[PDB]
Every structure is written in structure tokens, then in C-alpha cells.
Design a binder for these strands. Structure first.
Ligand code: MG
Ligand code: ZN
Ligand code: ZN
Ligand code: ZN
Lengths: 97, 62, 62, 42, 398, 424, 41, 38, 61, 94, 283
RNA sequence: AGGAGAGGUAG
């Protein structure tokens, strides 16, 4: 979807467009592919789960083998304040604040 | 750079065969025939006597 | 060839069909100046300004 | 004892200001090797 | 119609077939050829319009369709790349490495007049050797300074695991006879506008050591009255002392120290096809896998490097050198050229090696030097051309 | 109060940069007559991620006694046997021991006599198994030992190992069966080294060292070399000609498959339908336009490269048919110590697909010959004139290999493709 | 004729032409020509 | 160059210590895995 | 050095360099070719669409 | 001491001989001569460290002769064979 | 359980070349003898030099290194003692048993280039004179002037170190293979296949008999163990046509000397040194 | 003694 205007959320506009076909789309599993704004739609836990899945996919694409506990610890450390902060200095400063 | 003596591979004395090799090359002789006339059955000695460059002449001139 | 930044240049770091016979496309330094420094070929010459006047000879050809 | 360059002449100058070859003009001098015994291991 | 006569344009000479028949009329200077029109200079923009043939053999097959022709396809590469044998038989990365780094880092002919140059870190090899194979570019340039290094018998085999991780195992006896032995001359410069003097062991009355003095750590090399002392890793024997001054009156002193650099364990050696490695172990001559005629290999390399680095043609170079060096039991019509774009076929090399009395695949039956038993698998042996790099072991010790 | 370094002291070895925590390894100082160099076991190169080509290892000598006490209790080699990243073993057999073990266990036709077996028993810590081969011929005395029993002296009597995938059964410290695969020897989920570490974890290092020494001795007795016969990959000239023809036909079939796959777009929905279309010959006669259309689009290029890989796997599969069992490249590829099958294919048969990552202003002419480079309408000459294009996605196939000799245009294509890896 | 010269003759002529070109211009001539043109004109 | 974050890295974050040696490494299969040749 | 005699060539240079360098302060200096855009050809660029005529000596672009 | 004697406690009639300043040229011939004796069961030599010039020889015999006795017998037989070869060469050269 | 009985037959013998066959011996004895005669036989060579005037284009170490490799007569090498064992002197100049002093002096006073060979190298002992083959081994080349004067000494050394005290040169041995032909599968081969099999061998080891139209074995000692004829036989379809196996108890030696000692004397010295080493190892 | 400009090595 286009992001020309940031006033309205893309998911909000997508839900209004699918009104005639609400039954066809399984809304029990549909979710945005993004990680940052998915926490505002389905909660922090759903975003954490999708982040873990994406991290596992990236590790598999890299060709290396990494145990599950490392990725789970990374996910729990990057989402301790209820939001996924960035790796820059601003994110760490906000997390400490 | 004079001829390297003792022919590092297999340790063959080739220190006194450069003048004869040049004399043979001065005539109508190829490199293979010239090396065969010096009684060299191994290719290490032939490589040593074929890959050498005469550099001391330029040292004496320049 | 001079570029503004070393991290990114563009398509100059890759060989071009215009390099055929002018500069060496198979040899280039590896590192920051990868492809910016190009070694000239063996049969490479650089043209110089011609003192003669070509305009006068062009009208004679037609 | 110092040997000159293109000119063949023994300088043998030890003064700080004497750096120019006599009757030559050039100021390039080479140190001459004396007769000293040096041992080398073959 | 666009015509350019300005400067800065790049161009190359190309053979034209229109005037190629004028050549045969029953050593020619290049100016004569240019004046008669046999050769012409073609710019980059002009080359796009004309039709150019690659080789002479391809020109005679279909005439009247190629306007121009190339003298040699190997001249497209640079001077440091056209001399590499079987350039197109190697991977691009390895050719790039050989033509960029290993060519510059090689140790060969330094100069023929070392007295006039006081340059820092001058290195010269004792017995430089030209390669057995011939290159058309090298033959036309008529200079032996293009190749810097020596060629030694190289066998591709494992030696007790001492050559793993692309390491190199050399022969102790071959190195002690003068192979890969080079000298290093380092110069020290001091400027005086104080004066040169001793001012109170090896220094003379003029303030400089005599020629032939063995200098060590903590010794004054230049006496000023301050003095300049050698550092921790500076040593050598005094070769010459040069005193000079400019027009302003400032006096300059140059002292050169020379020392012999024998191949140590930490020294790194490189090949002509991008093979890089360090010396793993020095093995005695009696322990090498000698062949039937007793020729022991000087250098032993790990076979695992070839599948990874993907460097074919080094084996071809070894086979060609072995065929050239080995005698024939008519030496004319012998394949010696190794032009990168005119390489001889594999069948021709195999036939040439077979006519010399050896196996057509370049491998010979060898016997273990430690037990005397005959090995089950034949070992490939060939006199490849290797180079010695400037990176040493003691230069990295800290 | 200072004393010189001697045997028994521990130093902290590190290789810059430290990409993982296993780069810091504490090792005991062993004095050697060699000077201006440090000696390291080739197996320990895997934790350091380095090779013997100029790598410099800088160590740290602990001065405090407590620092030394904590160095060999936490940072020692025996303490870091379990990899903390994936949970597997940190140390493997190596690039040489793997190939030697593969050659020992695969041949099964070379029998070692009593003298050689007793000579090799000096390095193995365990005792000698029964010969298992009393008479191999009616007139053959001196009963011999099989090759798989030699590798059986590297396991404790109480160690039992089973690998269903490779049909490897180890009972009472004796190797009973083995077929192929060489997967249990390499690093993996069910490697034998991991099972040995989980069994005792007290003498695994000595077992690995003895195995390396014994395999090196055995391979020195045998001898491994690479010759021109390995690169030729043919028994004679007729086999080489047959292989060349087969490779040419396979490349042609792969190109046809790619051209067929290029039609899976929305523009050809009328043609792909089951109806009557008179433009069947137009899609086949337009052979020179497919490459131009592929080099302009990115999705088409991705589909083409995927189809080319899928059709070229079968072409790469021909090496096992045209390759002998004594081929060194095949042995090293099956053992997994160095190289793969595609590298051998590029060595002998053909390089295959060559495509660049970033977009360029020129495109490959799909032929890579002398006449293709002189064509004014070729994509390499700026544009093909079919509106004027500005950018292209290069796509070229090289029929020749490194052994035969690269064409200058093919060499240019290879250089363009490989220039990306040389960037900083 | 077109093919009356032969194949080996053309190869030898190419080698001789390369040798003559390297003897006339040399390995480096562009820099020398550029510097000489800057002095004269 | 030694200013700002580089100053921190070269002063407080990264430091140099004594009793350190740096040499080129070679292969020696005869030596044990836990032993280093000096 | 140029057009020197046979006797002058024996003493002096080592005949290994053709002499493409400079002697500034005892160190050899070599120029490197600088790739510059052609000033005698019409140049057309994009974003924005424009065509420019380069200047030979005076800034008459 | 050039030659050291060390008996093996785990295996009876077993011993290890450590010879200093020796190479393969002696160990190989000693091992090959020991295999000719019927009483010798295990005979072999190894060179663990190339830098440390030592040779380790392990001899296992039956319950009829000591390993040292077999070692001395092999040395004496090798000396006799060398003397016979020298005599043959001296006879052939004349 | 006892000694072996070697048999020695000499085919060719010269001053520096000897080719003899050793039979009824294991390969270990031959390998040990080769190693002893190639690395354990001591000779005399220059190791320490002392120059006084050196104005040549070459460096001093270069001349010392090419002087130390000059072969010398070593008839007294077995009787002379080592320098480290010579307790009568610390080692300086001429000695009675360990050191032999050499003097060299060259001065060029003509326009022609003077070649300093090995012929003008004089010593106090007439038995340690350099071996003359010819013009001799050239050391340096001198222009007008450029005097070279030096003093060198020679010591007894083992060929194991510095690889300059080794008198042997390419000491080889083969197993003397025996050729076995079934002689029944050759009759099935055509006339063209016989010539193809003959030309398949790299060396001249098989011959063709015109009167019998069959292959014969001529000079079987030049097989070189190159599995080319067997591979050709397998390719033609005959697996058991020619069977060639090495002989374990037969060997052929080829000893080439460098001129220091005679080849037969070299073999005798190697045998004596091996016996001495065995006696020393004896407990 | 201290700083700036180039080239180079290892992953
Ligand atoms: Mg590395
Ligand atoms: Zn030789
Ligand atoms: Zn003067
Ligand atoms: Zn004495």
C-alpha cells in the first residue's frame, strides 16, 4: 500500500476496503509484515513473535545455525519497555529514560 | 649474475659448462642438442643451464 | 579517475566495452580504489594536439 | 681518503667545510675501502 | 559525421586487410608501415564502426567481411598481466592478485649500478632466472626484467600435514645451494647545515665507520657533533658511505647496510597464478619422495588449494616446462609459447610430454624417502615458476 | 623478580578481529628450536577462523597468579569443547584428516599387511584388532588387515555409534558398516566427534590428535596428487568429445527451458490458454529478442536464473557419470573437505551461468563469439535499438571451461561478473 | 592473391610489427610526448 | 583525528598492555592441540 | 641523458628505466593520468533534462 | 645415555627403546630386521617430533626371549649382513 | 631370524659413475644405504673465508658462498677429525688434521676481462687440491684493476648440514620389474592393435619382432613404472594381457659422484659409516 | 619528540 499520507494507518484503510469481502479474508491470521507498527495493531507479543520468526528466517538464509534461546533473549531485550527501540543512540537513551 | 654453481636441484656440477654452452650456441646448434652434448640426462640441469641470464656483463659495463 | 566519495562511485568500478584494447580490464587494484585506477594496455597510445589545419583539407574531399 | 665521482682523484679531506673535490667542481665523494680482514661463514 | 583531432584520446594500432596484400612484394620500421598504410591508429569511437577480426586464422576463413584485424589478442591486457602464462585459464580474482600485488612484491633485478642509488630498502636476488615458457609480449619487449623469481621443481602432494591451510614445504638442501637467496640494502640519511665527528668504537676520525664493519643494535652509524644510533631491528654490514652537499651548503651523509636474507620459516612465497602461502617446514633432501631418476622436489604444495582457489593452467605450465626441459630420445617444432589467448591445446601438451619419455598426464611414480616403499598413487611434478615476496618473518616480529 | 618464559606457562592467544568468543584460547607454552615464528596445530585453525598465509597471532602473557589460574579454568581449550553458538563440537577433523578418513573407509579394496599395520599402531592409543582377512588368494600367505579396522582403533571399547543415514554402525569400538555420504565425519548434528565428546569428554583431544597423526601417516603411505587426468575428466579423446557434445546439448536444453519459462507472464495469457493461436512460430523464431527482454526486466531475470539453475543441476550431475573413482577432485568433493561439484564442473566441463548483481549500461550478446562482438545491434554496443534503453541486467552463459581456454569476450564477461567480490 | 601470403608469414609479420612498435614508441611515450609538447608550444 | 568518539575509543575503550608478542604463525601437526610453539 | 653518446651511457644510468619521473628533492615523482570529461561534445543529462556546451578557454558555457 | 630402556607394565614382554640423535635410516632397518625373527610379535618405530632428534622403538616378543635379546640379535645380524655386503662389493670391484 | 645374504654384480664402473645390482635384500637396506651415502659421507669443503681486498662488482658473501660450493678432493675425509673434536687447536689457519689453508690472489693489468676460475687456488696440502674437470669453475670476472685477494680454510663436514659436504649426486634404485605376457591373448589382437600397444609405452620397453609378428620384451629395466601400457590394454578390452609387478628382492643401484671421492670408495665409506652407526647404537 | 598525505598485510 502507498504511504503518501501518514495521517491514517494503512491497516485502517485496508480494513475499510475489504468490507464486501470480510468473510473471504481470514482475519484470524492476517497481520502486517512490518514489526514497528504491528505492536500498535495486535500488541507487543504479536510483534515479538513476528520478529522472532523473521530473525529465524534471516539466520537460516545466512546459512549458520543458532540456538533458539539466543534469539528469544534478543527479542525480549529489544522489547523490554513495551516498544521495539532502534539500535541507535536515541533508542538506547529512550529505553534508559 | 654468474652461472649458479652446483645446480641446486640434485646437486650437479655445472659451474664450468657455461662457456661450452655458449660456444655450442654460437654454432648451428639448438638448445636441446647443446644440452645433450654436455652429457645432461636430467631436466633439472637443463633447466638450470637454460634459464640463466648473463647479468655480470652489464655490471662490468655500467 | 576522481570521484566525490570513496564509499560509492557508481558503475565506474565495473569494466566497460570501451576498455577493449585501451586499458586492462582484467587487472585492477583491490580495495578502496577498486576500478578507479586502470592500467593501460600494451598497445596504448595517447593522442596529441595536431598543429596542422584540417579544415583546409576537408573541402578538397567534397 | 675519499674517492670522487666522475673525476678520479683522492680527496683525503676531513674538514667540515671541505666537501668539494679539488680541481673537479663536483661535491660528490665516495669513501674508499681500506685493506682490512673480514671473516665470512660459507 | 563526427571528426576529432584533439588530444587525450586513446587509440591502438590495428592491421587493415585492404592493404595487407601490398606487404608481399618479394625487419620493417613502424613508420614505414604507417606511411604505406599497412597499419593505422584507430580511436575508441572509430572502432565501433569498423569490423575487426580477432586472429589471423579466423581472417583467412572468411575474407571480404573483416575491415580490420588484430596483431595479437594478448596485447589487450596490461604489461604485468600479458606476461602471465595461461591467463584465461585462471580465475579472475587470482589473475587480478598476480597482476596487482604479487608482481610488485616480487624480488628480482634491482639495478646494474647500485653505487649511484642510495634508495631505501633495495633488494636483489642472487641468481634471477628467466622462465622456461615464452610469451609473445615478453619476446617482443626483449627484456628479462618482467619476470622476477626462480623456477623450482614443484610436486603436488601431502607431506605429513605440514603444508595444510595452503602452506608451502621447501627443500632444505636446495635453499642451502643458493636458491631463493637475496640481499637487502638499507640506507640511512643525515643532513647537517654541528658537524660530523666522533667526539669519543667502530667510528673513524671523520665520523663514519669503515667499509666492512658489522653494525649491531646500539651502535652509532653516523657521528654528529647529535649522533644517530641503530634501532632494535636494524643491523647489517657497511657497504658504502656517500657524502654530498647542495648549492645552499647543507651537507648530506648516506650510509648503506647490506645483509643476506635466507628463506626462513615465516617467509611468504607466491606463484604466477595467484597461489599464496608461507613456508611450513624445512625437510631434508633424504626424506623427500624421490622419483625414479632421483630428482627430489624442491617445493611441495597441498593439493587442497586447487579445488578452492580454482587455478587451472599452473599444472599446464608445469607440464609445458617439463616437456621443454626434458630431452627427446629433433628438438625443432617444439611448443614453447604460452601466449594467454593463444595457448596450445591439452592434447598437444600431452603428446609433447609423451615424446619426452614421461607420462602424458605429468605424473610420475615416486618412492617414499623414509621407508623406500613405492607409493600407490603417482605424484604430479613440474618445474613451475615461483616468486619470493618482500614480506619476511623478522619484519613482523613484535 | 622476573624469570624467562618456559614450558608449562599459559598464554592467551587471539586473532584480530575477534568475531566470536572462541577466538580467545589459552594454550600451554612449548619451546621449539625454530625462531621468529610460532607453531600451531592445523586443527585449531577453525576456532581462530584463519589460515597459514600471513596471519599474525598476538598473545597476552598473564603476570598475576590469579589471572593464570582463571585463564586455564575458563578460557582453556578443553573448557571450550562445546560450541556456545549451535551446541555442537568446536573442533573438527580438518581439511586433511577428513579426506584421509574418507579414503580409508571408502576404498575397502586395499589391504594393509602386518608390518604397515604395526607401524601405524604406534600412533593409535588402542590395541590391534584381529586381521579379519586370513586368505585373500589361494597362494597368498601373511594374512592382512582391512582398511576399516585401521579406523576402528580410534574409538573406546565402550563407545557405541549409530548413523542410519550413512549406514554406520559402531559396536564395542569397532566399525561394522559404512556405505557412502561422509556426513558423519563432517561437522553436523550427529557427527561421531560430538558423540565421543558426549561420551567421555576427557580424552577427546588426544583421540583427535592421534587420529590426525595416523591419517597423515596413512596418506603419506598412499599419496594424494592432482594431475592433468583429473582435469581432463575423460578416459580417452572419444569420451572427451562425447562429454563436450553432451554439455553443448545440455546448455541448449537449459536455454530452451529458460525461454519457455520467460513466457509465464500476464502478457501471454492468450497464448498459454488451450485455444487456437496462429502465432506459435513467432514465439520460437524470435530467439535473439528473448535475451534482450530478459536483460531489461528484473523479475524476468530472476525467473530465468532460477530456471537455468534448475536445468543446470542435471548438467552438473554428469560429473559422476564421466568421472572415475580415482579422481582427486571427486574425492575431495564427496569428502566435503574442500570444494564442491559446481567448482569441478567449471574446472572441466563448463563455467555455466554468469550474471552480475548491480545493473549496468551494457548487456551480454548471449553468444560470446567473434561475430557477436562486432554486431552493431548487439546489446553490448550500448543498445539494441528495440526506444533506446539506458540500463541492462547482464545475463551470459559461457560454454567453454578453464581447461579448454576462455574466449576474450568470455574472459571479459567473467571479469565483469567477478568484479563485485573484489570491492571493499 | 588473398591467401598467397600464407598463415605463418602473417604470424611472423605480426610479431615483427609488434617488435617494431615496441622499438619505436617504447613502453612509455605518452608522458614524454605530453611534456615535450608543453615545452615547445 | 583524536577527538570526540575516537578520543574515547583510543583512551578509555581501547588500551595497550605490556608483556605482549606478535609473530607470524605456521602449521605443526606434531604439536598438541592445547600447546602453542614459542 | 637524451641523445647521449656510447661512452656517456656506460657511466651513469643503469639503462633499466626510460626516465618518466621527476627529481624534486631526491625522490622520484610520477604523474598519473587524470580521466576528464570531453569538452568538445554536446552533453545531455537527466533530472532535470538539459543539454550543455562546455567551455574551451573562457567560461562561455 | 644414547639408548634408554623402559619396560611396559601393561603388556608383558614389552619394552620401549629411546635412541637419541637418530634418524629413519636406522629405525627402518632395525624394524625390518626384527620382523624376520619368529619370536618378535610387534616391532615398529616412530618419530613423533622432527625438531627433537629421538627415535622410539617398541618391541614385543613371545615367552622365549627378552626384547633386549632380540634387539641385540637383530643388531648383530645387521652388522654381519653389512660385513658380507662389504666383502661382496670388495670382491666385485676387483 | 638371522642375517641376509646380499649379492652384488657390477655392470659399469668408472671414476665418478658406478652402476651395480643388489639382490636378495629388502628395500629398507637399500634406502638406508642411499641415505647414508647421500647425507652421512663426510667430505672437505671451504666453510670459513677471510678476504682482504675485494673491489669486484659482486658482494663478498656472494663470493664466499660460491667458493664454499667448490668440490674438493676428499681422500683424507675418513681420517681427518672434525673441527669441534680437534682439541689441539681452536682453529686458525693451517692445522695438522682439521683445517687446510687456501690462498688466492688475482690482479688484472690488461684490457681484456680476467676470469678467476678455480684453477688458481693454491693450498699447502697437495692432497686437498680442487678437482679439475676444462676451464674450471669460474668465481668472478675482473675488469682492468679490481684486485681480489683472500684467504680461506677447509674443514671436514657432514653432508646433512649446509648440503655442501655431500659427495653423492642422484643415487637411485629400482625394483627391477619382471614382464609377464600371457602370450595367448596377443594372438586375438589384430596387426594394427599391436603397433598401437607398442607406441603406447612412454619408453622403449617392448619390441616388435617382424619374423614372428608378435611383441617381445627388450630392455625391461626402462619401464619407469608408468602404467600406460596396462591402461591401453584395459582400454582395448584385454584385462589380463600384460602383468607387470615389481620385484622386492632385486635392486639396481646408480651412483654418480661429484668428483670428491670415487663411487666405489663412496659405497665402501657408506657401508663403513653404517656399520659404525650400528655399533654405536648397539646396547 | 609530535601531527597530516600516500601505498601495503590479515579476516
Ligand atoms: Mg589468511
Ligand atoms: Zn641436476
Ligand atoms: Zn673530482
Ligand atoms: Zn685443528
Amino acid at each position: 500500500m502507498y504511504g503518501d499520507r501518514g495521517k491514517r494507518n494503512c491497516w485502517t484503510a485496508l480494513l475499510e476496503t475489504c468490507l464486501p469481502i470480510m468473510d473471504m479474508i481470514d482475519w484470524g491470521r492476517s497481520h502486517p509484515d512490518n514489526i514497528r507498527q504491528c505492536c500498535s495493531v495486535y500488541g507487543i507479543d504479536a510483534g515479538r513473535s513476528i520478529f522472532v520468526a523473521n530473525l529465524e528466517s534471516a539466520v537460516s538464509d545466512t546459512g549458520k545455525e543458532i540456538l533458539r534461546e539466543h534469539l528469544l533473549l534478543v527479542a525480549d531485550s529489544l522489547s523490554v519497555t513495551g516498544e521495539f527501540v532502534a539500535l541507535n543512540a536515541k533508542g538506547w537513551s529512550k529505553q534508559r529514560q | 649474475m654468474i652461472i649458479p654453481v652446483r645446480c641446486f636441484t640434485c646437486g650437479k656440477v655445472i659451474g664450468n659448462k657455461w662457456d661450452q654452452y655458449l660456444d655450442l650456441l654460437q654454432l648451428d646448434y639448438t638448445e636441446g642438442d647443446a644440452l645433450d652434448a654436455l652429457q645432461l640426462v636430467r631436466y633439472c640441469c637443463r633447466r638450470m643451464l637454460m634459464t640463466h641470464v648473463d647479468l655480470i656483463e652489464k655490471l662490468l659495463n655500467y | 579517475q576522481q570521484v566525490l566519495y570513496t564509499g560509492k562511485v557508481g558503475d565506474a568500478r565495473y569494466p566497460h566495452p570501451s576498455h577493449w584494447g585501451r586499458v586492462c580490464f582484467l587487472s585492477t587494484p583491490d580495495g578502496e580504489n577498486c576500478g578507479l585506477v586502470k592500467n593501460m594496455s600494451l598497445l596504448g597510445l595517447v593522442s596529441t594536439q595536431s598543429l596542422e589545419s584540417v579544415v583546409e583539407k576537408l573541402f578538397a574531399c567534397g | 681518503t675519499y674517492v670522487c665521482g666522475d673525476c678520479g682523484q683522492e680527496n683525503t679531506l676531513k674538514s667540515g667545510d671541505v666537501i668539494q673535490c679539488r680541481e673537479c667542481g663536483y661535491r660528490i665523494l665516495y669513501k674508499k675501502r681500506t685493506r682490512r680482514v673480514v671473516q665470512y661463514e660459507a | 559525421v563526427r571528426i576529432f583531432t584533439d588530444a587525450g584520446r586513446l587509440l591502438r594500432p590495428l592491421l587493415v586487410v585492404e592493404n595487407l596484400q601490398k606487404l608481399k612484394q618479394e625487419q620493417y620500421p613502424f613508420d614505414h608501415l604507417l606511411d604505406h598504410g599497412i597499419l593505422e591508429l584507430i580511436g575508441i569511437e572509430e572502432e565501433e564502426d569498423c569490423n575487426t577480426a580477432w586472429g589471423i586464422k579466423q581472417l583467412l576463413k572468411e575474407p571480404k567481411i573483416y575491415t580490420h584485424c588484430e596483431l595479437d589478442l594478448s596485447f589487450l591486457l596490461g604489461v604485468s598481466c600479458a606476461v602471465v602464462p595461461f591467463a584465461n585459464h585462471d580465475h579472475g580474482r587470482r589473475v587480478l592478485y598476480q597482476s596487482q600485488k604479487h608482481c610488485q612484491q616480487a624480488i628480482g633485478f634491482s639495478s646494474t649500478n647500485p653505487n649511484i642509488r642510495c634508495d631505501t630498502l633495495s633488494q636483489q636476488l642472487f641468481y634471477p632466472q628467466k622462465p622456461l615458457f615464452k610469451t609473445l609480449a615478453s619476446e617482443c619487449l626483449k627484456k628479462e626484467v618482467l619476470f622476477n623469481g626462480q623456477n623450482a621443481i614443484v610436486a603436488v602432494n601431502v607431506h605429513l600435514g605440514y603444508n595444510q591451510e595452503d602452506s608451502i614445504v621447501m627443500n632444505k638442501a636446495s635453499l642451502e645451494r643458493g636458491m631463493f637467496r637475496s640481499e637487502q640494502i638499507r640506507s640511512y640519511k643525515a643532513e647537517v647545515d654541528v658537524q660530523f665527528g666522533k667526539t669519543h668504537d667502530s667510528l673513524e676520525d671523520d665520523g663514519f665507520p669503515f667499509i666492512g664493519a658489522n653494525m649491531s643494535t646500539g651502535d652509532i652509524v653516523i657521528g654528529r657533533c647529535h649522533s644517530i644510533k641503530l634501532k632494535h631491528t636494524e643491523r647489517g654490514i657497511v657497504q658504502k658511505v656517500v657524502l654530498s652537499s647542495n648549492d645552499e651548503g647543507k651537507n648530506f651523509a648516506a650510509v648503506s647496510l647490506r645483509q643476506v636474507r635466507s628463506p626462513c620459516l615465516g617467509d611468504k612465497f607466491s606463484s604466477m597464478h595467484g597461489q599464496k602461502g608461507v613456508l611450513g617446514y624445512l625437510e631434508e633432501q633424504q626424506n623427500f619422495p624421490f622419483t625414479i631418476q632421483g630428482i627430489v622436489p624442491d617445493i611441495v604444495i597441498n593439493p587442497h588449494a586447487f579445488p578452492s582457489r580454482q587455478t587451472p593452467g599452473q599444472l599446464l605450465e608445469a607440464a609445458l616446462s617439463k616437456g621443454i626441459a626434458c630431452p627427446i630420445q629433433a628438438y625443432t617444432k617444439l611448443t614453447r609459447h604460452a601466449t594467454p589467448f593463444s595457448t596450445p591445446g591439452v592434447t598437444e601438451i600431452t603428446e609433447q610430454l609423451h615424446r619426452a619419455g614421461f607420462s602424458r598426464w605429468g605424473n610420475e611414480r615416486v618412492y617414499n624417502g623414509r621407508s623406500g616403499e613405492m607409493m600407490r598413487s603417482m605424484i604430479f611434478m613440474g618445474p613451475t615458476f615461483y616468486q619470493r615476496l618482500v614480506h619476511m618473518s623478522e619484519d613482523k616480529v613484535k | 623478580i622476573f624469570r624467562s618464559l618456559m614450558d608449562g606457562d599459559t598464554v592467551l592467544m587471539n586473532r584480530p578481529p575477534s568475531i566470536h568468543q572462541h577466538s580467545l584460547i589459552a594454550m600451554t607454552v612449548r619451546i621449539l628450536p625454530t625462531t621468529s615464528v610460532v607453531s600451531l596445530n592445523p586443527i585449531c585453525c577453525l576456532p581462530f577462523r584463519g589460515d597459514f598465509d600471513g596471519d599474525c597471532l598476538h598473545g597476552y602473557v598473564p603476570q598475576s597468579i590469579q589471572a593464570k589460574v582463571e585463564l586455564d579454568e575458563l578460557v582453556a581449550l578443553d573448557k571450550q569443547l562445546i560450541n556456545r553458538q549451535n551446541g555442537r563440537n568446536l573442533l573438527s577433523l580438518g581439511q586433511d584428516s577428513l579426506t584421509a578418513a574418507y579414503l580409508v573407509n571408502v576404498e575397502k579394496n586395499c589391504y594393509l599387511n602386518r608390518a604397515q599395520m604395526q607401524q601405524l599402531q604406534m600412533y593409535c592409543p588402542f590395541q590391534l584388532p584381529p586381521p579379519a582377512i586370513i586368505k585373500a588368494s589361494p597362494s597368498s600367505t601373511e594374512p592382512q588387515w582391512t582398511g576399516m579396522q585401521l579406523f576402528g582403533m580410534l574409538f573406546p571399547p565402550g563407545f557405541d555409534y549409530t548413523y542410519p543415514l550413512n549406514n554406520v554402525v559402531v559396536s564395542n569400538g569397532e566399525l561394522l558398516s559404512f556405505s557412502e555420504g561422509s556426513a558423519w565425519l563432517r561437522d553436523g548434528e550427529g557427527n561421531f566427534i560430538e558423540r565421543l565428546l558426549k561420551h567421555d569428554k576427557g580424552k577427546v583431544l588426544d583421540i583427535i590428535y592421534s587420529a590426525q597423526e595416523m591419517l597423515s601417516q596413512w596418506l603419506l603411505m598412499r599419496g594424494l596428487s592432482v594431475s592433468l587426468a583429473d582435469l581432463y575428466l575423460s578416459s580417452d579423446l572419444q569420451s572427451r568429445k562425447n562429454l563436450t557434445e553432451e554439455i553443448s546439448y545440455g546448455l541448449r536444453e537449459a536455454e530452451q527451458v529458460c525461454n519457455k519459462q520467460q513466457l509465464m507472464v500476464e502478457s501471454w495469457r492468450d497464448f498459454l490458454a488451450v485455444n487456437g493461436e496462429d502465432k506459435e512460430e513467432d514465439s520460437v523464431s524470435d530467439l535473439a529478442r528473448f535475451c534482450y527482454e530478459r536483460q531489461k526486466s528484473a523479475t524476468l531475470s530472476e525467473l530465468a536464473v532460477s530456471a537455468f539453475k534448475d536445468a543446470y543441476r542435471d548438467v552438473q550431475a554428469l560429473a559422476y557419470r564421466y568421472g572415475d573413482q580415482s579422481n582427486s577432485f571427486l574425492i575431495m568433493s564427496k569428502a566435503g573437505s574442500k570444494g564442491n561439484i559446481g567448482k569441478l564442473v567449471q574446472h572441466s566441463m563448463c563455467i555455466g551461468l554468469q550474471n552480475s548483481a548491480v545493473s549496468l549500461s551494457f548487456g551480454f550478446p548471449r553468444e560470446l563469439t567473434c561475430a557477436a562482438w562486432n554486431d552493431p545491434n548487439s546489446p553490448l554496443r550500448g543498445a539494441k535499438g528495440k526506444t533506446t534503453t539506458e540500463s541492462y541486467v547482464p545475463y551470459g552463459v559461457i560454454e567453454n571451461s578453464f581447461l579448454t581456454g576462455l574466449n576474450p569476450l568470455e574472459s571479459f564477461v567473467h571479469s565483469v561478473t567477478s568484479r563485485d567480490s573484489s570491492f571493499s | 592473391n588473398l591467401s598467397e601470403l600464407g598463415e605463418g608469414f602473417l604470424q611472423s609479420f605480426c610479431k615483427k610489427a609488434a617488435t617494431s612498435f615496441f622499438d619505436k614508441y617504447g613502453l612509455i611515450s605518452h608522458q614524454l610526448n605530453s611534456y615535450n609538447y608543453f615545452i615547445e608550444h | 583525528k583524536l577527538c570526540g568518539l575516537r578520543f574515547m575509543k583510543d583512551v578509555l575503550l581501547g588500551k595497550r598492555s605490556d608483556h605482549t608478542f606478535r609473530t607470524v604463525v605456521v602449521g605443526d601437526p606434531s604439536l598438541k592441540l592445547n600447546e602453542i610453539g614459542i | 641523458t637524451s641523445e647521449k653518446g656510447k661512452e656517456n651511457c656506460k657511466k651513469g644510468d643503469c639503462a633499466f628505466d626510460q626516465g618518466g619521473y621527476f627529481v624534486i628533492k631526491g625522490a622520484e615523482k610520477v604523474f598519473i593520468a587524470q580521466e576528464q570529461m570531453c569538452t568538445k561534445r554536446l552533453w545531455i543529462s537527466n533530472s532535470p533534462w538539459t543539454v550543455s556546451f562546455r567551455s574551451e578557454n573562457k567560461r562561455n558555457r | 645415555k644414547k639408548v634408554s630402556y623402559d619396560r611396559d607394565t601393561k603388556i608383558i614382554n614389552a619394552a620401549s627403546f629411546t635412541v637419541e640423535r637418530e634418524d629413519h635410516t636406522i629405525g627402518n632397518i632395525v624394524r625390518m630386521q626384527l620382523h624376520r625373527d619368529e619370536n618378535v610379535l610387534f616391532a615398529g618405530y616412530q618419530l613423533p617430533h622432527p625438531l627433537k632428534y629421538k627415535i622410539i622403538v617398541r618391541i614385543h616378543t613371545t615367552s622365549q626371549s627378552s626384547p633386549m635379546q632380540a634387539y641385540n640379535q637383530a643388531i648383530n645380524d645387521l652388522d654381519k649382513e653389512l660385513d658380507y655386503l662389504k666383502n661382496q662389493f670388495e670382491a666385485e670391484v676387483a | 631370524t638371522y642375517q641376509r645374504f646380499p649379492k652384488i654384480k657390477i655392470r659399469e664402473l668408472k671414476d665418478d659413475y658406478a652402476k651395480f645390482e643388489l639382490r636378495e635384500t629388502d628395500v629398507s637396506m637399500a634406502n638406508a644405504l642411499r641415505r647414508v651415502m647421500i647425507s652421512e659421507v663426510p667430505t672437505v669443503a671451504i666453510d670459513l673465508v677471510e678476504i682482504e681486498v675485494n673491489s669486484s662488482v659482486l658482494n663478498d658473501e656472494f663470493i664466499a658462498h660460491r667458493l664454499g660450493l667448490i668440490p674438493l678432493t676428499s681422500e683424507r675425509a675418513m681420517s681427518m677429525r672434525f673441527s669441534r673434536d680437534c682439541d689441539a687447536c681452536d682453529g686458525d689457519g693451517q692445522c695438522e688434521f682439521c683445517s687446510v689453508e687456501f690462498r688466492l690472489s688475482s690482479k688484472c693489468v690488461t684490457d681484456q676481462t680476467l676470469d678467476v676460475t678455480s684453477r688458481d687456488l693454491y693450498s699447502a696440502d697437495p692432497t686437498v687440491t680442487p678437482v679439475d674437470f676444462h676451464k674450471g669453475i669460474i668465481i668472478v670476472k675482473l675488469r682492468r684493476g679490481q684486485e681480489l685477494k683472500l684467504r680461506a680454510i677447509a674443514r671436514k663436514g657432514i653432508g646433512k648440514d649446509h648440503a655442501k659436504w655431500s659427495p653423492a649426486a642422484t643415487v637411485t634404485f629400482m625394483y627391477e620389474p619382471d614382464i609377464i605376457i600371457n602370450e595367448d591373448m596377443m594372438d586375438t589382437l589384430s596387426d594394427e592393435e599391436k603397433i598401437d600397444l607398442i607406441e603406447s609405452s612412454p619408453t622403449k620397453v617392448f619390441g616388435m619382432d617382424p619374423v614372428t609378428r608378435q611383441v617381445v620384451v627388450v630392455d625391461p629395466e626402462a619401464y619407469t613404472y608408468d602404467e600406460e601400457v596396462i591402461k591401453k590394454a584395459e582400454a582395448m578390452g584385454k584385462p589380463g594381457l600384460i602383468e607387470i609387478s615389481p620385484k622386492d628382492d632385486s635392486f639396481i643401484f646408480t651412483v654418480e659422484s661429484t668428483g670428491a671421492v670415487k663411487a666405489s670408495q663412496l659405497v665402501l665409506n657408506a657401508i663403513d659409516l653404517l656399520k659404525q652407526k650400528l655399533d654405536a647404537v648397539r646396547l
